[PDB]
């Protein structure tokens, strides 16, 4: 659900975002320094909670730039096929 964003939407929207990204960076350091590979269920749950908030402002406020920077490509599979000349033993 949300359970906190209703309360924090009444004031500024942006302080919780930085206070959550610093927690993500600290948990990522603590995952690097522990030889663990799968992310925890405590930051995954805390990841989407970030991505929700940055969505909603774009739903609501329409901030004046929202900059566009893309690599202007994306990977797709392409067809493969064997050669037609037969093998020689």
């Amino acid at each position: 659900g949300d359970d906190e964003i209703e309360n924090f939407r009444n004031g500024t929207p942006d302080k919780l975002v930085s206070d959550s990204l610093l927690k993500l960076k600290r948990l990522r350091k603590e995952r690097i320094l522990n030889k663990v590979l799968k992310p925890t269920t405590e930051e995954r749950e805390l990841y989407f909670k970030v991505k929700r908030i940055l969505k909603e402002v774009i739903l609501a406020k329409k901030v004046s730039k929202v900059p566009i920077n893309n690599v202007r490509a994306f990977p797709v599979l392409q067809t493969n096929y064997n050669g037609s000349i037969p093998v020689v033993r």
């Binding site: 940055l54 739903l59 990977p75």
Partner: protein, 71 residues
């Protein structure tokens, strides 16, 4: 300064693993490659109007889900 390039486009996502591109993966929320090319195609031209893009994709995608993809 010289830095090894951070090749993000190859890198598979860690936290969700369901918002990757369709090659790196092994209304409807499926996001085939045609709507993905139409999404990059609409973002290159229309520059964040979110409603000409939302039917330039082809109408099956909500504006909320287009923002979910653009993030």
């Amino acid at each position: 300064k010289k830095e090894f390039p951070v090749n993000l486009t190859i890198k598979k996502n860690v936290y969700d693993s369901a918002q990757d591109f369709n090659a790196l993966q092994d209304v409807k929320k499926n996001w085939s490659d045609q709507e993905m090319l139409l999404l990059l195609e609409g973002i290159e031209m229309y520059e964040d109007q979110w409603e000409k893009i939302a039917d330039h994709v082809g109408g099956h995608k909500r504006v909320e889900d287009c923002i979910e993809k653009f993030l």
